[PDB]
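Write out the bound-state structure for M0X.
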Amino acid sequence: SGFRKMAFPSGKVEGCMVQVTCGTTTLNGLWLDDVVYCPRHVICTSEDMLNPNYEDLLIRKSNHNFLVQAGNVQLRVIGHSMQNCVLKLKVDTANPKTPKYKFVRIQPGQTFSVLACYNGSPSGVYQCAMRPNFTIKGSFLNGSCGSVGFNIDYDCVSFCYMHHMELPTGVHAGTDLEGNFYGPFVDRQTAQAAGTDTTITVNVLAWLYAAVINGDRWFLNRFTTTLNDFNLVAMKYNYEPLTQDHVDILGPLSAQTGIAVLDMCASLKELLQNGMNGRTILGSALLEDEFTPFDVVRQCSGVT
Amino acid sequence: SGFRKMAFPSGKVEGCMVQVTCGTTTLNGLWLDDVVYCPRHVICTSEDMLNPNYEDLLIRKSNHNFLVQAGNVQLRVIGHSMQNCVLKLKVDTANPKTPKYKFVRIQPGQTFSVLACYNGSPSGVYQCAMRPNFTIKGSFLNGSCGSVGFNIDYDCVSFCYMHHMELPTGVHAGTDLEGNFYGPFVDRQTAQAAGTDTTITVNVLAWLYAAVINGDRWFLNRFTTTLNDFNLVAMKYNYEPLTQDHVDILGPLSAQTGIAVLDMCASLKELLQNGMNGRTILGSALLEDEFTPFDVVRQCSGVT
Ligand SMILES: CN(C)c1ccc(N(Cc2ccsc2)C(=O)Cn2nnc3ccccc32)cc1
Ligand SMILES: CN(C)c1ccc(N(Cc2ccsc2)C(=O)Cn2nnc3ccccc32)cc1
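---
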């Protein structure tokens, strides 16, 4: 027992991290096969970022201007192309540590692990979620750009995120590995405010099921509710609407605990209306929303 | 910016995880050089655990009874010895993935990363702390025994913990890599209750400094206090006493923010006395104590 914000083991991704330098800008790249993926803003100066014309800036760059270093050894760049907001640097050597991989574009509410890197070197790993406003609440400093988000299914790493920027509000924005930003963010240093950061309701319910599985049952009440009634309360508290799809995804957790999904919704409804009253659930004084129902099942069953 | 419960990259430790089986018990081992370290309770049945005589149980075991598997390949056991509560299985092959390593016995309040494993395979990585009552609040299921806690300093992995058991209260107990349990716990299925789980005061102050560095300043007040006055309040709230050593360790964070350590103690004192009032600090509704001052500096400076 015990429930922790657990990240995937990062070894498979550590073997893909490289340093990319263009001019005076150095950030991280992801080396898969003979291609190094990195944010296209590597070609920019801090001044360029105010109003960059990436196509024009890229015309002034050649293969030899992209310095790619894997460990202490230099990789030879034999091609370069811009795909949306990422650059793909074709190198003459396939990464011998390339794992089985996929590029996936995740949905808001979905969680992933981030391997924060600086100068192509991993500094740490943490678990986060794609917020409903398409930002991530990560931990990134200058130089962390190019750090990636991923999930692992046994031996296949599914890359979902590449870090590009920090908004003036301390939240983070990035792309999938095809270079498309999550949300409406652009790689330009301009006025970009995030939308409402709503709570991922299905994740909170999954975490309430994890709490019951791990012994924290004080919040279980004698009530039930309906999806419509629950959703009136969820709207009032800036919680995402709960759908029948979400109820269905919670089915295995509902079956394991013997607590019907709508009964747990009534528990959540009372927690929203009355607060925790100075009490905690799984060592937290707030309702955790960065564990999906899949994460709760995975952690409670020990999938390796 | 942003502050996350960050674990070290686990790749270096993933390359050391092996499966050890003795009879019908299978748990994890740590393979460093030509030695596999694992909990000595691998020789026990669930019945044996009630009152095990490890020396007597070990007499009935030979080298060939310890099945060590690294990936899908079997390791040949050429020696076995019991050191305190761990077994050291000498194998005929040095682990080619052995990193630079040390075995350290940590103090309470110190943090480390855990790579949770099952059948020698890593399932996840999370950050935790050695509690002042010598337990850890981890996430371990049956089969997780032998999973290790560690810190990394650039390229040297310092192993500090090996998982052995879960107490009836859902908290975890284990040893250092010399086989000595942290605290008064024994590898016997008997009445073992943990002592007071006090809050690691120096860590809370470090995390309050991280909050100021990352923009959360609402809790900063117009007051100061003394170590003696602060400690009267800390005792009342089951917080560890703050010493001059702790003040000294907080010096670099105090210098970076320009907030004297005792002023932050007064902030913490008001937070203890008045509560958060429905507010949060770094997205938490309680005072986080599982980041050391070293962790805060490391995360805020990006040490790789
Ligand atoms: C010189 N170039 C290449 C460059 C200059 C600025 C940046 N920006 C600013 C920005 C804002 C909107 S568009 C660009 C980042 O946010 C980068 N960033 N990512 N995470 C960070 C954590 C802290 C500080 C910085 C951070 C990226 C690249
Ligand atoms: C059959 N053998 C070898 C064996 C049998 C029992 C155990 N015990 C029980 C115990 C309590 C005090 S002394 C032994 C564990 O706690 C093991 N453990 N570790 N973490 C876990 C998370 C969940 C469930 C089990 C867990 C270990 C080994």
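---
The domain at 1-14+100-197 of chain A is CATH 2.40.10.10 (Thrombin, subunit H).
Helices of chain A lie at 11-14, 54-59, 201-213, 227-236, 244-249, 251-257, 261-274, 293-301.
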